[PDB]
Ligand binder design. Structure first.
Ligand SMILES: [Mg+2]
Ligand SMILES: [Zn+2]
Lengths: 48, 83, 63, 21, 87, 225, 698, 577, 237
């Protein structure tokens, strides 16, 4: 809500990769970017 | 072309096969339909000849139609179009 | 609606899909698996499923 | 011990035990 | 589910029908027709000797003679060596 | 260059074991030669062993003979330790009978002509006053280890009890080499083969059989040239 | 499966049940070893599956209060004097007081040599306390542990997970045909065996009068006699042999309490779950790769690991609406070939071997009136065979069984036996097979180093020592360190010492390393047995000293050096291995996870009732479950046609399975599938839930 | 290939075997053929071999965590009743041989047969679809064998020593054949630094440039190399065109070599090289002389002194608490800290004391199995043990498992052991639920077009600038910049474009970008693809499983969901986030 | 008894001298038993001749280089090392070779005494330049197996004669592997796959025949203990 969609995409990808890479498990970012893209499809209606 | 001689299921090199098609899905549909044509020809040989055509490459004694089709693909005796 | 019902909260999904008179399109990936038709992925798409296979003219003439 | 026909199984136990099983 | 199809006896029965059609065709048209009408092969209802005689313009005694000679012929090993394993 | 041919000596230690010295071998070859000889000796030496037994009072292997201390399985296990040598390829039969109190040993079983029992002091079963044992055994030639042949394959009756048979008179084989490796580069190996057989055939005879098998097998490369 | 399995199934504490917590409501908090479990429940032994922590076993010395609390004995120490009075305490009393440690260094008089001793406090805290404040002490070491775990030698060197696995997998060992006693073990084998109830023991002393393979007559000291009946080849509840062989002669004298007959897994009275096998720790040509096990063919030849399994079959000839079933030779539409093994009354002969698909009991059922096909009528007329109006339902041995037939127990209504209503004839056939060892069979030591048998090599191509003795089993070295179970290495070393025999050379005094060694242990005969207890056993320095003196086998030759390794020769190539390899005699057991009970296959079998999918499990024919994860992988592979095949013309298409079978048989192309009957059932169910569902074309 | 017991393959192929039996006149009809199969007559096996030849089968293992849980092999009949499995697929299947079972499925139609032959064959799935790392790598035993074979031991037998006056260097070898013969005699060790003259192995890039320049054809050239016979024998397994390695084959080195081979060579060559590597690794792991014994696990000498010193500090802390100076929680923190320092010191001492040729040290350091913490537990002391709650016991254990633990120490250890054992069981179910949610939420995303022709794109850090002035590489570059399509061009200082729009952005391109000195690039991604349903191909970029551009029908959504959800079991927890 | 299936030996020629041999089918186990022995016999049981010691004029203690040539002493030593030579006299013989002026010297320029032949005259040995002179002494004798460079036991008998490793064996590289053809019908009989690569001195088939002859003699040594001893008989040819 404060920084648009690009920054929240970056933050989500970075946090998930931070947790996954802690145990030394390497997953390419695109595999999480697919889920993020599925996350950020819809929009709310504030004016009918 | 520096590989050792292949054997078993991968008698025709898959990578050499893929140069004839666009993607492995196209390759598998190609081989499946060619094998279906070969099997129909085998089951339709006793009676009068129909437009189905048998194996162009010389077939082995106990050789699967799918393997014959794959060798036909590798020998460049077929042509196909996508959709 | 079929995918959501097969996924989770089937009663709540059905009771509101029926009220909306929702009509599925069977265009996804779970619905084709459920109804036994080819999935629209890989070798199931129309680009590959409708490939025409026939021998070339030269090899046809050579036999 | 404490079993009349017990085979002689030599033990490495260092300390005795007062209570039997 | 005992009411389902065995999925093996079905194809066995289909090939038994094919072999029966072959062994019938090894005989002549008259014998094949009378035996098929008698035992109800082409139709569910098995016809009787009177019906066969009415259809073929002969008497039931002639039908019985044909049936007997055909039954004797079919018991030869040349015609039963293929049907033995189907029972 | 060495143009000296190797020789084979003999060294008797006991009746059923001895040492064989082969000298001189090429450097680094004694190990392989001894390994091949041991591998052939331990696997492909012909012998003779019991194929199947038949006891009058029993019908299978999982019963008990009335009176004896052990069961039929234990009797089978004891009989698997027998050492017998035959003279004909056809299967011969030998009988064992004993009644009343006493211990049945491998010396009590009467063999027909040709075959013999080499360990009469081997214990089979223990008998009491009420017991009575009457068994018959089949001795057959062969080699290696063959599992129990099924009763269905043969036409034998219910009473026939197939038994695992191990036609192998050799018991334990080892070797050791003595590499000289002198600074004059005229080096050679010195194989010392050790053969022990279970009193059925002599170690000399076992080594002779192994040598015959090896020469016949190795002549394949030479024959076609 | 064995007396240990029975004994450990008794003394079992299960937290789940009526009035107890269920697994779904079982939080992680309860599945923990509370510090009050010391001496009342084993922290090691518990199932490793979904029931982890909900099932436990009583400790060896534990006792149950009349209210239901679990007591634990203790020796009360007074002003530093460790008395011999034993007082039973519960959790409250133990928390109230201060307990000492079992291996506290007493002064052989009652006092403590050192004022500072280990102590467990009320909250489970472990501290060093002056000896004056201590007022209780453990009765003996290994008090906190259960029986099955106390049977594990060198437990204190093992980890906890692998000790758990070994304790849980010691109870699944099958009874072999010889069952020799283990070389190295603990003191909880004799007691465990004789307390398991599977060993006959003379109740009153006397002299053996008559001994045989079936019965023992003990002549008591006063006139009266008593006969004990052995159990020859009785079927256990899990299909294992239960033989009982006597171990006394015709003139021996036995005192009340002596072991008089062995059990399934016993040897000379004590316990024996396996055999002693020569062991190598080298990785051999990748056949012993990732917990794979290589076996010498000597085990197959001499039946070192060969178990007897007894299966029973039950068929009841019962009353029917259309008549009464009878057991008879006359089976419809059958040949005389399969009836060769059947006796006159219908059942097979005793001792007649059977094979998969044979006839065991010949039972016929009134078929009734049913219309036949015209082709069937024509065939019957051609061949002159009659209708044979009864149906054949005979007891056929199922798929994948063989072996002899031991005994037949047949019940009847005419001889007045207690049978369930509607059953006129019942007959039981016992089939036993002598299963050898084979690849895929599960083997395991006492430290949870499991593994299937990768390949059984011949005797010649196995590593052998300098004297020509080949090893019997070949483990992998990579599996030892990362599993933290060097207890197997210590057991291997001690087993080699026990097998070879040792002699401590006290020519100039007793050596320092053996100062605390008990007497009659400095020298031992070859193949002698030892007993290292659980938490107070052989030390590493003592093991090194014992390995130092390893008196030669037959010639002058010490095949095992000081480190515990040896010079092995490669039996396949011939050259000696360039580095020494550890060898010894580990104790391994044959687990009850045999291949013959696991291998399964299906082409076309029975189908479910409501849905038309195939059944499941090996009991019926059944097919493998193609789960949601497998469907996801199938989809992710870019694959469509294989998924369609596995979901339509293999499981549910009623008019598709027959067509595909016919096409395969005739050599034609596989036809296109149809919609699934399961989907049709779902549509009908939705329509039944007052939800109008209509499938539309356009 | 895969093993297949005949007793089960016969039941699997029964319809086919019946058809062939009737065709070859071994049975008069289907009824006779079925009776023959049920009775298992001895010709049914001869027919079964023919009818099984060239017919792929599928192997399944529960759970099917990711895509590679299903693979297709060519069956071969074997005795016994155990499905023999290739050792190299155990990593992909997550299957050890402790009693695990594998399911088997059988395709019927021509489409399914070719589908298993092409898409799902084992030799066509080497790299993991998630990260692109190979999964047909030499595993534990093969790694140990190759490491032992290619390691170099100074001062071994038959080394290369340069001598003058007395005699020549006596270390040079004319050919690897002569080297092998010398090793056959008691002259040369496998791991001695020698100087052989190779004629069929391609020299490395620098040596090739120095000697032959442009045309350095390995087939005919002759060159001098300073390596070991083990490394020559290892390089013989690699394809002809690959340069000579001349390294110590650590697991990471083998991973790099296999990744480069898969990137640069055909898949059939890659599979054959992998098989040769497996064979050599097993053969040389057999002779590696790696074994375990109680005398092989050395204990640290100064452990007693270290323990006494740390116990003295602990007793000082105990006294200062007894005089009421510090509270219980901070006292516990103090003991935990000092015992952690004690553990660090003991571990360092053990690492220093242990040699480099020790079996345990070689196993750990070669990358085969385990970590140094397990070795420290083996020799030294276990250290701190957690509470059932998750805290730490104030009194840590002092004895390693080699010395044997006392009753109290074992009881303390059981806490953490059982806690972890139950945590694993809970974690597996949680990971399964997460994967099941992800697959559905992402089942929509499938590649439909080839290029959405968009101009949008995300930005990647790509080795941010250092304050001193240089291009310090960002460690996370193989998971955030590799295998992607450059949305825009890469230019700097108003110069020429280094990489134009629409390139695979591989390792050479990344190296060129770093050499040019550009930091940030706008790269195309699925977050900005402008397709209606599903993402395009260029946005997705290269598929890790294949190594080329993704196809036009891939279920990238399900692939990504499986990739995310599979390693969910290894995610541990820390003792307010 | 009878082996019940006679194994046979078949050849497969790859290059001028590199032929792989197949022996099939052998009863289980015997594959390794005969294969390892055959490999070792091939490697170190066939007579052959090779250089033993060399000497070059102008080189006494400076073992760095020799004037007039480009490739150094190590290179020329390892070049003479891979020189196939035949002989018929057991006593050591002496080779001669001399050239003047710049150019390329090959094996063909050597002058062999009556009794030795060179089987590769077109092998590159050295590269003369700047009107240089090459005078190399060679010592060639016949032997067996592989003998390293024999140390100069004699102190003052030959100051300039330096030794070199001797590759006596005509064969160079021999490797083998086994298979498991037809496990089902005939209980996993074994097959052997030998790979032989020799010099041009003798054919691989001749090498195999000589190895077979010496091996059958070696095992007939043991066979000559009990002539009438029963064993496994393969049968006819
Ligand atoms: Mg497992
Ligand atoms: Zn796009």
């Amino acid at each position: 809500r404060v920084q648009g969609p690009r920054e929240v995409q970056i933050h989500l990808v970075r946090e998930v990769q931070e947790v996954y890479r802690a145990q030394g498990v390497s997953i390419h970012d695109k595999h999480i970017e697919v889920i993020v893209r599925q996350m950020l499809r819809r929009v709310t209606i504030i004016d009918s | 072309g520096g590989y050792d001689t292949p054997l078993g299921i991968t008698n025709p090199p898959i990578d050499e096969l893929l140069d004839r098609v666009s993607s492995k899905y196209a390759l598998v549909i190609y081989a499946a339909k060619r094998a279906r044509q070969i099997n129909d020809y085998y089951n339709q040989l006793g009676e009068g000849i129909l437009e189905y055509v048998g194996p162009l490459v010389e077939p082995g004694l106990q050789e699967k139609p799918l393997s014959i089709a794959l060798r036909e693909i590798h020998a460049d005796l077929l042509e196909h179009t996508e959709g | 609606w079929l995918s959501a019902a097969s996924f989770q909260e089937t009663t709540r999904v059905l009771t509101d899909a029926a009220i909306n008179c929702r009509s599925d399109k069977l265009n996804g990936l779970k619905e084709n698996v459920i109804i036994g038709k080819l999935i629209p992925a890989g070798t199931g798409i129309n680009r590959y499923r409708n490939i025409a296979v026939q021998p070339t003219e030269e090899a046809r003439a050579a036999a | 011990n404490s079993v009349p026909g017990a085979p002689n199984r030599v033990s490495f136990a260092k300390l005795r035990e007062p209570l039997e099983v | 589910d005992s009411e389902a199809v065995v999925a093996v006896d079905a194809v066995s029965f289909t090939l038994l029908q094919d072999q029966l059609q072959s062994v019938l065709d090894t005989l002549s048209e008259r014998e094949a027709g009378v035996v098929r009408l008698r035992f109800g092969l082409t139709d569910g209802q098995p016809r009787t000797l009177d019906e066969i005689g009415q259809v073929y313009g002969v008497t039931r005694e002639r039908i019985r003679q044909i049936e007997s000679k055909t039954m004797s012929k079919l018991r030869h090993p040349s015609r039963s060596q293929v049907l033995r394993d189907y029972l | 260059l060495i143009s000296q041919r190797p020789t084979l000596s003999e060294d008797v230690l006991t009746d059923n074991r001895s040492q064989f010295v082969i000298e001189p071998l090429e450097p680094g070859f004694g190990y392989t030669l001894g390994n091949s000889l041991r591998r052939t000796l331990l696997s492909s030496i012909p012998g003779a062993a019991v194929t199947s037994i038949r006891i009058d009072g029993v019908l299978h292997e999982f019963t008990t003979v009335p009176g004896v201390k052990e069961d039929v399985t234990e009797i089978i296990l004891n009989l698997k330790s027998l050492v017998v040598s035959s003279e004909e390829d056809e299967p011969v039969t030998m009988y064992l009978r004993k009644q009343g109190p006493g211990e049945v040993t491998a010396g009590d079983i009467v063999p027909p002509a040709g075959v013999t029992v080499h360990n009469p002091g081997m214990h089979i079963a223990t008998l009491n006053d009420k017991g009575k044992l009457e068994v018959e055994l089949v001795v057959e030639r062969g080699r290696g280890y063959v599992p129990a042949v099924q009763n269905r394959a043969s036409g034998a009756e219910i009473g026939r009890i197939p038994v695992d048979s191990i036609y192998s008179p050799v018991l334990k084989v080892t070797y050791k080499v003595d590499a000289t490796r002198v600074e004059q580069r005229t080096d050679f190996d010195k194989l010392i083969l050790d053969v022990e057989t279970k009193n059925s055939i002599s170690p000399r005879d076992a080594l002779a059989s192994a040598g015959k098998t090896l020469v016949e097998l190795f002549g394949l490369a030479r024959e076609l040239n | 499966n064995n007396p240990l399995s029975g004994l450990t199934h008794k003394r079992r504490l299960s937290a789940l049940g009526p009035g107890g917590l269920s697994r779904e409501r079982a939080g992680l908090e309860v599945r923990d070893v509370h510090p009050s479990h010391y001496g009342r429940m084993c922290p090691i032994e518990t199932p490793e599956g979904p029931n982890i922590g909900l099932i436990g076993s009583l400790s060896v010395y534990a006792r149950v209060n009349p209210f239901g609390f679990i007591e634990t004995p203790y020796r009360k120490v007074v002003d530093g004097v460790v008395s011999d009075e034993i007082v039973y305490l519960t959790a409250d009393e133990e928390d109230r007081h201060v307990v000492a440690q079992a291996n506290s260094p007493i002064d052989a008089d009652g006092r403590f040599v050192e004022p500072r001793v280990l102590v467990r406090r009320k909250a489970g805290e472990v501290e060093y306390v002056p000896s004056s404040e201590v007022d209780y002490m453990d009765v003996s070491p290994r008090q906190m542990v259960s029986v099955a775990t106390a049977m594990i030698p060198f437990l204190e060197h093992d980890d906890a997970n692998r000790a758990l696995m070994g304790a849980n997998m010691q109870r699944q060992a099958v009874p072999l045909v010889r069952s020799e006693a283990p070389l190295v073990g603990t003191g909880m084998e004799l007691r465990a065996a004789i307390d398991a109830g599977d060993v006959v023991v003379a109740e009153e002393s006397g002299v053996i009068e008559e001994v045989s393979a079936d019965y023992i007559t003990v002549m008591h000291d006063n006139g009266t006699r008593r006969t004990y009946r052995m159990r020859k080849f009785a079927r256990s509840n899990h299909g294992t042999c239960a033989n009982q062989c006597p171990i006394v002669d015709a003139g021996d004298r036995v005192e009340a309490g002596q072991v008089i007959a062995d059990g399934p897994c016993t040897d000379d009275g004590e316990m024996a779950l396996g055999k002693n096998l020569l062991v190598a720790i080298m990785p051999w040509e990748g056949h012993n790769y990732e917990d794979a096990i290589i076996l010498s063919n000597r085990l197959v030849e001499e039946d070192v690991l060969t178990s007897i399994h007894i299966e029973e079959h039950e068929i009841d000839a019962r009353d029917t609406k259309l008549g009464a079933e009878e057991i008879t030779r006359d089976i419809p539409n059958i040949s005389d070939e399969v009836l060769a093994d059947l006796d006159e009354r219908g059942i097979v002969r005793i001792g007649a071997e059977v094979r998969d698909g044979d006839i065991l009991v010949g039972k016929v059922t009134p078929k009734g009136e049913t219309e036949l096909t015209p082709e069937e009528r024509l065939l019957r007329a051609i061949f002159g065979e009659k209708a044979r109006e009864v149906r054949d339902t005979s007891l056929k041995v199922p798929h994948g069984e063989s072996g002899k037939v031991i005994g037949i127990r047949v019940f009847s209504r005419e001889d007045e036996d207690e049978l369930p209503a509607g059953v006129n004839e019942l007959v039981r056939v016992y089939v036993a097979q002598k299963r050898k060892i084979s690849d895929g069979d599960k083997l395991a030591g006492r430290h949870g180093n499991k593994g299937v048998i990768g390949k059984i090599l011949p005797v010649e191509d196995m590593p052998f020592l300098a004297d020509g003795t080949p090893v019997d089993i070949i483990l992998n070295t990579h599996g030892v360190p990362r599993r933290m179970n060097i207890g197997q290495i210590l057991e291997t070393h001690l087993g080699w010492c026990a097998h070879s025999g040792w002699k401590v050379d006290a020519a100039k005094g007793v050596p320092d390393w053996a100062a605390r060694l008990p007497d009659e242990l400095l020298e031992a005969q070859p193949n002698a047995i030892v007993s290292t207890p659980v938490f107070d056993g052989a030390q590493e320095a003592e093991l090194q000293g014992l390995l130092s003196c390893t008196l030669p086998n037959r010639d002058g030759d010490v095949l095992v050096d000081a480190d515990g390794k040896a010079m092995l020769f490669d039996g396949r190539s011939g050259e000696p291995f360039p580095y020494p390899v550890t060898v010894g005699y580990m104790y391994i057991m044959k687990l009850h996870h045999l291949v013959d009970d696991k291998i399964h296959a299906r082409s076309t079998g029975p189908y479910s009732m409501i849905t038309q999918q195939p059944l499941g499990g090996k009991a019926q024919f059944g097919g493998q479950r193609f789960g949601e994860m497998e469907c996801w992988a199938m989809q992710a592979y870019g694959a469509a046609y294989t998924l369609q095949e596995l979901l339509t013309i293999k499981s549910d298409d009623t008019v598709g399975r027959v067509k595909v079978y016919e096409a395969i048989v005739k050599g034609e192309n596989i036809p296109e599938p149809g919609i699934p009957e399961s989907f049709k059932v779902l549509l009908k169910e939705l329509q039944s839930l007052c939800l109008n569902v209509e499938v539309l074309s356009s | 290939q895969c093993g297949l017991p005949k007793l089960m393959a016969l039941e699997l192929f029964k319809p086919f075997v019946m058809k062939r039996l009737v065709d070859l006149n071994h049975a008069q009809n289907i009824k006779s053929a079925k009776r023959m199969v049920e009775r298992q007559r001895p010709q049914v096996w001869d027919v079964l071999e023919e009818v099984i030849a060239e017919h792929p089968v599928l192997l399944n293992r529960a759970p099917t965590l990711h895509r590679l849980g299903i693979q297709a092999f060519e069956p071969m009949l074997v005795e016994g009743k155990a499905i023999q499995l290739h050792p190299l697929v155990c990593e992909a299947f997550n299957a050890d041989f402790d009693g695990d079972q594998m399911a088997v499925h059988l395709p019927l139609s021509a489409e399914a047969q070719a589908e298993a032959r092409i898409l799902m064959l084992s030799s066509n799935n080497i790299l993991s679809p998630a990260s692109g790392r190979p999964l047909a790598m030499p595993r534990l035993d093969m790694v140990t064998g190759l490491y032992y074979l290619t390691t170099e031991v100074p001062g071994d037998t038959g080394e290369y020593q340069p001598a003058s006056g007395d005699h020549p260097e006596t270390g040079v070898y004319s050919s690897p054949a002569e080297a092998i013969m010398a090793a056959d005699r008691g002259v040369l060790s496998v791991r001695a630094k020698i100087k052989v003259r190779l004629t069929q192995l391609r020299p490395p890039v620098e040596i090739e440039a120095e000697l032959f320049g442009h045309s350095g054809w390995q087939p005919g050239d002759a060159w001098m190399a300073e390596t070991t016979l083990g490394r020559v024998m290892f390089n013989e397994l690699l394809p002809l065109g690959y340069p000579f390695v001349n390294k110590q084959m650590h697991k990471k080195v083998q991973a790099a070599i296999i990744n480069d081979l898969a990137e640069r060579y055909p898949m059939i060559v890659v599979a054959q090289t992998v098989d040769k590597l497996k064979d050599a690794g097993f053969y040389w792991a057999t002779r590696s002389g790696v074994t375990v014994s109680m005398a092989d696990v050395l204990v640290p000498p100064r452990k007693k002194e270290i323990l006494d010193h740390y116990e003295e500090r602990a007793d000082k802390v105990e006294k200062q608490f007894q005089r009421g100076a510090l509270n219980h929680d901070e006292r516990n923190e103090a003991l935990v800290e000092i015992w952690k320092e004690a553990t660090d010191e003991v571990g360092q001492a053990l690492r220093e004391h242990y040699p480099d040729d020790n079996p345990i040290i070689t196993i750990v350091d070669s990358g085969a199995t385990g970590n140094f913490t397990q070795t420290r537990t083996l020799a030294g002391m276990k250290g701190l043990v957690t509470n059932p709650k998750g805290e730490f016991i104030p009194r840590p254990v002092k004895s390693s498992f080699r010395e044997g633990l006392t009753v109290l120490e074992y009881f303390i250890n059981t806490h953490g052991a059982r806690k972890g054992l139950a945590d694993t069981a809970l974690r597996t179910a949680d990971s399964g639920y997460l994967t099941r949610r992800l697959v559905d939420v992402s089942q929509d995303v499938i590649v439909r077009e080839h290029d959405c022709q968009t101009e949008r794109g995300i930005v990647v850090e790509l080795a941010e600038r250092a304050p001193d002035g240089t291009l310090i590489r960002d460690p996370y570059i193989e998971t955030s910049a590799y295998a992607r399509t450059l949305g825009t061009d890469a230019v700097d200082e108003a110069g020429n474009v280094i990489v134009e729009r629409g390139q695979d952005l591989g390792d050479p391109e990344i190296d060129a970008l770093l050499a040019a000195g550009i930091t940030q690039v706008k790269v195309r991604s699925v977050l900005t693809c402008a397709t209606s349903t599903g993402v395009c191909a260029t946005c997705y970029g290269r598929s890790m499983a294949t190594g080329k551009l993704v196809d036009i029908g891939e279920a990238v959504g399900i692939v990504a969901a499986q990739s995310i959800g599979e390693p969910g079991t290894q995610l541990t927890m820390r003792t307010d986030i």
